[PDB]
Design a protein around this ligand. Sequence first.
Ligand code: HEM
Ligand SMILES: C[C@@H]1[C@@H](O)[C@@H](C)C[C@H](C)C(=O)[C@H](C)[C@@H](O)[C@@H](C)[C@@H](C)OC(=O)[C@H](C)[C@H]1O
Ligand SMILES: C[C@@H]1O[C@@H](O)[C@H](O)[C@H](O)[C@H]1O
Ligand code: NA
Length: 396
Amino acid sequence: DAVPAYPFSLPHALDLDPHYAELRRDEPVSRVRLPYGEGTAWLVTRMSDARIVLGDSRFSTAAATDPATPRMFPTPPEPDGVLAQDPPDHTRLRRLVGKAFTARRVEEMRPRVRSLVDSLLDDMVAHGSPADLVEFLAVPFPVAVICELLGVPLEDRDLFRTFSDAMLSSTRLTAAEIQRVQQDFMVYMDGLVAQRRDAPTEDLLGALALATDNDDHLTKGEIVNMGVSLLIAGHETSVNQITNLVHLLLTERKRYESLVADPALVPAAVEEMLRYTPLVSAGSFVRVATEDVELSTVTVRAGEPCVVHFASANRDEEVFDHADELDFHRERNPHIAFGHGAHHCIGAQLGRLELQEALSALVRRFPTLDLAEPVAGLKWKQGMLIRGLERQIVSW
Ligand code: HEM
Ligand SMILES: C[C@@H]1[C@@H](O)[C@@H](C)C[C@H](C)C(=O)[C@H](C)[C@@H](O)[C@@H](C)[C@@H](C)OC(=O)[C@H](C)[C@H]1O
Ligand SMILES: C[C@@H]1O[C@@H](O)[C@H](O)[C@H](O)[C@H]1O
Ligand code: NA
């Protein structure tokens, strides 16, 4: 056809396809064909344009549920998904659980979360060096935190992890395989929610069960799906981002030594690595203009779809200086690693807390930590909408 395939290439590690800098400079809004649905989408590569697609009510995610709309992933979007809701319906859906995820409430978790880290790092010191940081820290830490927050049984880890990996599929699985898991995950979350019917609990699944027996704006579908979205995101983002930040730290070891030297740098370093790291391997959930909307180089017509690349917006040279370098001493870091606008990540403060406390703990107690398996052999996850390591053997 006329228009280039997107994604532009099979990803390697955390590397960014070089065409994104080319486009930011010469063609910052460009037509692409996504791997699923029909027609073309505008790919948005710059920060200013990304804030408009993500930030403006003239862009609808609900409109992108149509099986014909371009998308990054095999199945048409679940219409009951938060991501697929427009305000004000979306605002009402987010209030269901927003209370738990305000920065004040998430800060209240820091002591429990720091305990959970320390304990898991004891178990890793017991085993002895070398060990797999995935098995010992990256998987168990976020999984325990989201299980205790939602009230999901921790022994269900293998079950919900298998479900979440399938649903984060890009090319790994087929539409039918994914569609099947969506059905099972919904029927599973439905069951946990129903156990609260004559046994309410002090946790988020508890709040979802109350909204089911008493609410009128929100369907049972929308409420349970919120449980699915929180359990997937709540472990998958963090499990992958711990390995991504540890990868970035140990492959240029001075990064790691610079936090060993000043542990109090860890928060700014987390923000900078959030900027730098393509957690979302390519593209985004799609937005469809409901009216003509002016971007930097082009006016998108009502009914035309747009996709953002978050990591490309976060490499924008008009916003960050030496944008292609990791710098923990940056004075200004207005990244959209957590998106922007109405769908801005609800868990952003939990993700921040988990990355701070994982890395602070490692940097303090394990000043000798190195990668103890070769770079060339690193097992990057393939065929998923997000990036991370299956294993990260380390020594201290
Ligand atoms: C480093 C950790 C994380 C990163 C980098 C991340 C990134 C993102 C981004 C970029 C979005 C916006 C997608 C868009 O509008 O197209 C998002 C949305 C979301 N994230 Fe996060 N996330 C992280 C952690 C978490 C955590 C811990 C949770 C839940 C506990 C979570 C739950 C969600 C949910 C439910 C949405 C959809 C929100 C909505 O549509 O209103 N995320 N995340
Ligand atoms: C399965 C996820 C869903 O759980 C969301 C809420 C979790 C995460 C944290 C997201 O919101 C995530 C950033 C997604 O928007 C993208 C990876 C997108 C391309 O993938 C998606 O849109 C996929 C298909 C979503 O449905
Ligand atoms: C189609 C898309 O992909 C599946 O992983 C997830 O079930 C997500 O919830 C859905 O909207
Ligand atoms: Na989409």
